[model samples]
Target: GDIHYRVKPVPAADRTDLRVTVQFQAPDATPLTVRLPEDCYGTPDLHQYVRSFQGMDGVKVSAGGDARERKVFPRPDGRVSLRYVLSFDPRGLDGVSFGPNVGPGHFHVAGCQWLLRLGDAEARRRYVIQVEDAPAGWKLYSSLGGDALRTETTASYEDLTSSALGGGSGGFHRFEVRGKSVSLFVDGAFDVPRQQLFTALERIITSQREWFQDGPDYFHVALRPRSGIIAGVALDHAFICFAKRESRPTELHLLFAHEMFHAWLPGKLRIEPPKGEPELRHEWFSEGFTEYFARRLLVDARLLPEEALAELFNQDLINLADNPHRAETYEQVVKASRMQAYTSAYKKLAYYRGALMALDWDARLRAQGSGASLGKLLRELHALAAGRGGELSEDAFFDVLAAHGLEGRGDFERHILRGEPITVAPEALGPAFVPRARDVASFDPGLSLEQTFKARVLKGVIPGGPAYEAGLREGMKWVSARNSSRFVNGWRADLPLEIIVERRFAFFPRGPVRTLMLFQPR
Candidate 1:
């Protein structure tokens, strides 16, 4: 009745690959084709690992399979033993964004990157996973359950693909959020105390659940240490937070709050994507509104002060206005993003602009003096989605807008879809916090930071822009950056930045190191 997967880490001491044995139960007395998930959130080819397939018991495995599938002939006894090595790169063990990672004492891998399916994606089947030979004294956790070493789950291919499971030398800390058990897996030590982290998470979870009046009974959280970055990804019944040792308590609070909110928004209150643009569109509501509520819920729960909330909003407003892609329509930005592998401009505009739009809508709803709020509107949308089996269509979203006496689709099309500037009310946040205008400039480094970081050579030098005017040009070797903010330039645009680079002469072994100062962009 179920397909079973048994996974064990190979090369015991190093533990760099997974020896996976997939047993297909009661085959249809015919050859079955097993599918490999090569498309694991845009990770590099997973087929590289499938090449290590080793069949047994006279089971015949095809030498060559298509891009995304593999074929296997079942034994005459109506059983198929599919054995393969899911390899992980040691280089990636440090940071495996969307794929598999097997480290010295820890391993984190999304199921889609390793697991194989017997049939097409739409086929429903029960799955039982048994993970054996984890590092001594290590604990395992997964979207399926906290005890992922051995677990049973009923899920489709999509569900399994979106889920993740990992085990490491970390330990789990059990906490209660409104009586719901939350298992937080911790990997490395932190500057912030563990109890403080637990408290912050609990507050956010409690506040969000109380607002929605509904939430999952069991939740899983994994906190792993990364190098100089604090980020997270929300998953099924679980979320993973990667942070640096220097991460502060406040940063984790906001990170968890924003990510955990996805459980209700796009997780349960589903939004249907357009026919052509599948995942690129509709992030405005998903991420933007999540940003809005992340701070709002914290303030409401007294975890963050109201003044802090106001300041955050004010900063967001400035950042949105100063964005280079601010004038681009939502559709235009989406198109640009789709064309490129990476576009930081589109991401900034989506998160900041969308958040301000949500602020504007919330203020408008409350202005009717009906005691209405964004939370109330979200509750209605959630109920609507629940009735329709978690489907929240565009029309349905606007229908709720009309019920609040606001222009529904028209306003959305004008401001949201067409990307007109959203005007938040002066009194939007109340008298305590007033919206004010400020002089600001867009942050344009004039050189592609992405390219510079990748090849250590300058590229994307904007002609006559700040860096260009200051004498930084294309093809220069980057030495080091100093006297400037690398990550916070978007929020603090007026800061003077200095770029240090080496201009090598063709014949010289070493070149002169020159420092250029960049001013605010007009």
Candidate 2:
């Protein structure tokens, strides 16, 4: 019902916290309910997350009604409000582990998570978010930008979060690449050549825009500094990249290309998972495909050399070779990602496995020599679904594939859709690559040193592997892998060699699962 949010910030407030009040517009409401995100990006831990939403007295904020329910009360005329402060101390309730930092210099508020969310049932109507009486040196930047009073309505939560709201000190570097406007808000100073960074991104954006040629015409990119830290995440229509002072130029290019690539493909071309399968099951397309494609863009845009791209893909293949996690059946990758998202066993499976699959699809489609390519096929799919709302379904995706005359559905299902070994030929990646058998030497953890403390599906270590020599036990218990000294004599030399013991869980007296191993860093 025509929503409006009023935000207020103080100029010379105490450095301890960035306190702000957000007044929401509601109609005659008996009770209001808000929600906290169960998970926010890569960071998971509500103990450290809740402090960002507190009261003026430096204590946890109080809800109008049930705190867990987030029930708020409004005037009979329908005015609602919630006030909270963003604690500066890392120990405080900081909503985002890396992205969201609300303080004096700049603050990033990600929709309902950090901002007071609208009651779940309010989607059928529209609302506006307005900022008034903001502090000096302050301005707002989001995919949703312009003078305040930004009103919107959409049923999709992804649509809402895609354009996260950000307020910061003025002077964002705004530019246009391929007729698409990009807004950048960088906090603090920079020592690197900014023009080189900009040029690399421009070429990549132009290349990708021509590749997919879809999605929004404009977006925002904000790089806020964090002292002695390096991190970044891609948001819909915008990227809240953590600007670490030590960020290298090539690293910055990879990050930009990775996130910007999202504007196309699954982000715009759209994808649907198999029937009855949870949506994330197709993360292979959304994440992996994008990741694989990001490197290509880096190479094609001339931002990154093909040699570097080769190194990256080589490592991806190694990840698949070393760990059995991403090498599972497509369905397994989907299901496992959901089950072990927060586990040390966590490896973003869809991204790598799906990416390799995308490479196969691209190579095969091009090999057909029918003037057809993955890019062309995607364009046709986009045209088919133009103006059609609601994402494409899994069956529908296959239908499009069939329309392209890719009738080897059975072979594809057996080798790709269902569980099977991944395969690729050098011809698929073009002439710059050649097939050669070379012995690759690496520290072998007898058992697969998956991301988790203990392995999920059990396996035995090589009889003479470094992991075996280090007393790799077999029993189910959690594990931890932290970084140690890396590189000796200008080569690789890092170690986590130690026998870790933990109370065994009551599973079986048959086989022990406790293990000590070294995780191969990517």
Candidate 3:
């Protein structure tokens, strides 16, 4: 069966929704079904925005389920058409959340979050996507490249769902690296110079391509403003990053390198999980190694001075030291992350633990002489994965490690499987920097910031901490706090923090506001 989608953006009049119509040719007599993804990677329910659904006669839509299956009675011509309005409301925008954001002349959405899925999720079919009648002066781009407004490509169901599509008056930079087309789509203004951002990206892209000696023929990088913290998600032949306007180029560079590296490891150099093991078990390798290699590559590209890299890695060490879940076994951390998702400390421990392991391994490999390095091992694995269509079993990873003169199984068992604390020699990071042991102080604000800010009360105070010692107690009514955004300061081990808290009882009288000074132990 052939499927084609024609997308038209109503960006001028109202500009509140996108009109999408898809046609299916030769669908079987069995009720033709389509679905709207409800929850994609923590994005809010997308099915709620599927309005003004129009289809062939005898169309039946389910209003009961999250998937919201839509069934169309087959036509004698064996053809079916489904059309819907994907509503976009800019007023509800949360820079921290995912979903669609539309403006008078532009719109952005995670590809899978908005697309109406056809047939079974596992079913593969040739799909054609075309967009037309965009607002004047508008330029659109999709991870599923359609030159101008029309693009036709064959892709698997997973690939189709994981892609991203968006565009607007926002900046779009296009260039070539190693003869491969590269595209950068950006939204919202940033403190960093636009050209400087893209230039840094060009250097990183060129270095990575040259490092692997191979890469995708076309690469896409999409950047949008996010509230609070910076984040990124790797996509097929593309990736999306979110940052605040004030985010430094150094932060974005490391993030870009980390997410972009995923395009190869596990993305292209696929490692099938061992039987009975969840894929999260190997996240350390994909994520941690990525962290380590990102810094390494930055040094190779001369984007990061060795001294700066040392400070960053030193921070990584401090982060691991401060994590309460640092001692959790790899399997335990994986299980906890699955159960707790975002809040669990175990969720991020893998990044620190795995990265330190890579650092140790790279140092060992470098000591072996003959120019042997982690990059060399990765290049070898890339070659092996390339021949097999990017599929490599978990055992093969160990075999490659052993071939590279590492005690692969032993190291995996000790550090990853057993969750042992990983350490590196003072000289592991090169002579430009020397590692030293330093006591890490916890970034304890003494009370839960969310509780104080959102609940307007002091709670979750740590005993013996500054807030506790400063007479800030639980159930203290919130009056107001100065330098509250010094949450920026709160997370630093060396920064002094100050906040004011007021306590009052309903039956008792109101109390004077007290200023509290917070200090970290030297």
Candidate 4:
């Protein structure tokens, strides 16, 4: 009485490839094509590595003469049966240690990238995914949870694609935080203690719940080694990568905190903005506010110290001050965002701009005697979005902002929507943290939108930022307009002070150096 898709992974002896068995009923002979995923989840593509498709019988058998390079499987009975091999690139990718390592080391399978779909994607269908077979005693985890002869069902493609499926030669364990199952899958060894990682995740989750409205029921984290830089992707109920031993624990803490924050806000509230990037307006809330929110939670949850978050926020402030594209408005980026994805320029600003805006709003609310903060506004907005059945009307989003007394704030029009210089009051982690500033060059961590998450180590390293503090010193890599922001309160024409240079490279008792702080005329 139910339609089903049985997926059997032949983790064969060579392990160079995966043989997927797609079994299901065809609604009609519209064409059963196997293709990779596009229209990534408002972010970058998951970047499918599974390729060199070869199929047979009802699966491939000449496929189709279609335009999308999709293979059409043959239909014999009332049902459809097909077999195809998605070969891994002879192991190592670009001799690289970035993203998730594929093939024998591990596998991240998803319906969007590998599943054989029937009929137009626009038309929805109900089906289930059955794990027919995987490597012997191998571990499998999906959005569906536990996997002992599992039979997971979904009503449509979006439902399926939003949740990914992963399996490998076993080695995963589970624990619970706040009554929700937390599964950790490690490829091999890790630098941090499992307990420490789990404890931090628990704190982040609990901290975010203090402000967020909704999220998935459970979550899973799969850890594998990565290099170049700190990175990972937030997928349906899953975070699939962590810098394998390379990333400092601080980097991992923020990385974990950042993605976990995504679980609630934009992840649950769907904002259908005007078509065409027209600039990336949504990311101001999605990526920007999300990052800000997470950092607050990490510190508020005590996952990070107040001083640590101060340093992190200061990095955003510095980035904003030095942004060559600072003159570019959200409107500009929003327009540019449509034709292509948000570029490095779009992301850097959206992240910092949105964060600063959130903090700006926070400061304003803190000033209000009524005491309505951005968190309260977001919580209320979450309700409005939820009432729309998870669809956030653009008007409703703006209305919430307006209702919060941000209606005619000059910074709103001049600074945000447009690229105007922002003259503002002091901002900090909270009134709980003190005010401080220093005249420093912008920290440009050469991170492209594509390379940021793919980096095995931080590419373009900046001094004093998280990457720098986390022990990366690759030196400046990318540069834009040298537009800079000076400390609003640097009154010293010349002042004597002590300084500490904690160089990450030299470690042989070349300990911290105490010295005078001086800025010579260039």
Candidate 5:
């Protein structure tokens, strides 16, 4: 069985209008049900599905030239057809499209066409999709059951993500799903070697596992040329948007890990409101925990070294230390993080400090020899919240921690909740192996000391000894104190005696070898 969708855009005087007509190809298809959602701008009545599906939420009609339009047509034959039409006035809007290209990022103006192939056995649901119109020179690849599938290239824009097609002169990439497996194709401009691409994909998969510990049936990624744009966006439950410039493998690796981690945290764990509206206060755990796991994924994958891991933590330490808002308590950071979001003043503090708190919690657990960790804690929390109706609470977290012999984590909690510093001596944390240098010279030059020989002598003082009482100066030249054979012999000064101004010494033809005493005090 197959479904068909027809989309058309009507150019208007000032704004472009889009109209979509979708029909089910199945002859025995029951009356198709459809839903339309508000476009990107939240404008109601801008565009409407005019048929029997009119006024249904989730079905979208174009509001204006700048709006994104999508409609879902569900058939009684168990087939779902989705039609999307986008309209934009290039004269005013210049560049805009839907899917990955809707926001500040470059135009990723391609579409996804999925054909679900239900399996007779309990293996899993698979999809066989035909992708077309991907950007030139880009290849398509897929990740299925934690493995990469075959790749293909096509020129039909209707089935490609906005980044895969030549939207806004930017390229596009494509992916199709089949029964717990996905096939991906890229626009091919990236000269990445096949081995390296596989490595990157493996890294992304590892990250997903680290965060969620379970792979989803579907996942996809796309790459596009750099564009300097910054905007807020989120896609279908399974999609995300990224700027072309920010699409490097490293960033994509982290971004993928972050989003995938969300699948377990707020997604499967249900940490916030039932409607999925984020509770800003809980964002610390949601975003912070995910961010922490993403880094750990890199570490576990051996992409990042242990020292580099310290660098990540050190950066946060410096930022928090220098931050003016450090004066704000942890409660303030948590409350404000939820309320302000990207505009929140305490955003950085929330993630950074929350990570520290998580680390502290993990450390306490380890100290108890319970063999528990944040990873384990998160897994337990996820299991407890799955299929349950309530949000995870602080009490629940503490109870879990206590179960693992970490009942005294309250002090750690106080430090996190109040923004108080946790005292940790470097020595107690264990020695950090680093290269060291040693001197073989007889004289030991004290480079670490504030006072040197010359400075100490000039100041008429020693650091903490009797040498400071002796009269001395830094630049005073040394002279022989005993009679010398070269001086005809014989010149001498009385002990503790001062030189008379009228006295004169004979000039020696040969100078005597002098023993000079260096002093730092006068």
Candidate 6:
């Protein structure tokens, strides 16, 4: 027999007040109880609340709209459900929900609603929910393990629920949870709409599998779209909710990945503090690693390409290198920027460059015949942490590296985590990696002519050239390097003129600009 629940909203004295009761179908089952925090109900000033939470560090909340009314209760049959009547006013704010002006406002609403559906369910249980008089065009989306299931209407809740629980999405699309292996459907469509959603989900699944590879059990995600400007909200063990105006593919990808990755990181890895210092110590392994794989997943899925990857990393490298406050050491950077980096330019370096560091260390280990790449190292660290049921510290990670003969990883660490500049010779950096030449020809057409003149003069110093044998000094400037008759003054000059003189080279030291004017008369 399965547990079931019924939720009803009751009136309270205050307009913002809400009372909800969750009743279970199992008569003999002991009634489970949950108390809604005072903060969960009423439209308290969100600015004050956000400030309070933000001040605590590592305590992050989804942006947009203040909480209106929320109540959580457990039924008699070991079942739990929550009721949230949120008030969202997206008029003036910037974040995952409102302003910041990155994506279309409608997309933001869609994303927020998507989060509500997916994030609210309790782990290890199947849940069916109905939004009282839900707005039209609202849809539900859920990810059961790796399988993402969506339904167009509440009338199809049974089909959606069974499909999510049974891991089938019609025909070839099926997600099965066979012990530790999770099979899920990835949208095959090549268009951007499907690509963005698929890529976001793929990143979450891939990264989780890479990190833990076990114990996801069962999960489901759903969405409820409402009117007005509600950012989005994620329930502890239920669903998230948002207004219809917030749906966007790109912002959805970023926000969803951040939230979903949390299920595996602090939720399973236990490396994060519930509160304090934003858990900076574990950020590289958690947030940083997620950011790295998120982009990689998108690329591998063909949603993006290699050039995008390179450009993304290069931009991050430049940002980090140019940052005025970039720290001198990995430890300092981690301490100062790990938590705040996600919201700043520091994130570009922390995630992109940090991944590069991990990759380089893997290469070094392989070079030493250690057979221990970063993947293997992460697995080992995860195992150790799991065994201890605690977080692994920086020293713990370094100890593993040392055991694998990865000592003196300072160069990689400096260039990456410390935000130090990285330079390579043009040839060494590869032809494609060279900086594109700026269109400076428009600035001065004489630039190329001056360059050729210098090259010829340099050749003259090579002992066998005419100027070298003539004992000509290299610093003389040619006011007139060619005979007057050979020099043309028209816009399209047709003349051949050549003369050598030595003068100090403005751009290159110890060299002279030799003037050579050559043209064909027509």
Quote model 2's TM-score: 0.68
How would you encode candidate 4's per-residue C-alpha lDDT over 263-309 as one tens digit per residue? 67676775666665332456666788888887777777777777676
lDDT tens readout by residue for model 6, 1-522? 222222122222221111222222333334322222222122234322111111011211222233422222234343443333322233332333322111111111121221122222333334343223212332222332232232222222222322221111211211333353333222111223434444455555555455555454434333223334333344332223333434555444545555665655545555533345455434555666655555555554455555655555554444444343445455665565645533344444445445445444545655555466555666676677776665755556567767777662454455645647443222211234544422111111222244446565332233433333344444445443542221121211133223445542221111232221111112
Candidate that beats the other on TM-score, 4 or 5, i.e. the better one: 4
lDDT minimum window of 10 residues, candidate 6: 50-59
- What overall lDDT, based on C-alpha atoms, would model 2 receive against the true structure? 0.55
Give model 1 RMSD, 1 decimal: 7.4
Kindly list the per-residue Cα lDDT of model 2 for residues 1-522, writing each as its tens digit: 454455554433422233445554566756656654433444453223444443222212335443333555566666665565444333232334464555546666566444444555335545456666666666667556544335354444445654576767734566676666766666544555555655665576667767755445556667665655445667656777766567777777777777776655565567665567666666667777778777777777767776666566665565455443533566665666577653322345455566677676777888888998766887777666656553676677778788776643543465445756566545655666654544344434455545334454324545555544554555435344333111111113233433333522111111222221211223
Give the C-alpha miss distance for residue 480 in model 2, angstroms.
6.4
Off by over 4 Å in 5: 1-21, 24-179, 188-195, 210-215, 229-237, 245-249, 270-278, 330-344, 367-370, 387-390, 407-413, 422-522
Candidate 6 TM-score to native: 0.45
- Which lDDT tens digits does candidate 3 get at residues 1-522? 678888887765534467888777654566656777554656566676676777745444434334477666656667777778887655455443555656565677775766776656667777788887776766677777736377776766666766776777667788887777888877765888878888888899888888777456667777776556678877667777867788988889998988888777767787777788787777778788888989998888888987787777676676676566777776676676567744435556778777878888888888898799888998898889888888788788889999889876688788778868676755577765665445444545566767777888777877766677666778777776544332232254443455555542211111222222211122
Clashing pairs in 3: none
- What's the residue-level lDDT of 139 in candidate 5? 34
Local distance difference test values of all predictions, in order: 0.70, 0.55, 0.70, 0.57, 0.41, 0.37
Query: Which runs of model 6 end up more than 4 angstroms from their true locations?
Result: 1-5, 8-174, 179-207, 222-259, 266-278, 328-349, 362-372, 408-522
- lDDT per residue (tens digit) for residues 381-474 in model 5: 7777764643565566567667777653475355555657643222211245322222211211112112332343223223332222233323
- Is 2 or 5 the stronger prediction by lDDT? 2
- Candidate 4 yields a Cα-based lDDT of 0.57
Local accuracy of candidate 1 as per-residue lDDT tens digits, 1-522: 678888876544554467788776655657666777564665676676554786667777885467556677777777777788776665544454545555556667787878875567777888999888765677777778757788888878877887887877655577676677777777665888777776777677778778777456667788876655787878767888877788867778888888888778777787777667556466777888888988888877677877767767777766665555667776676677668844455566667766877887888888889999888988888877988888777777778889888775776677667878767776667766655444444455666767787887878877766677777779888876543332353323343566677642211111122221211112
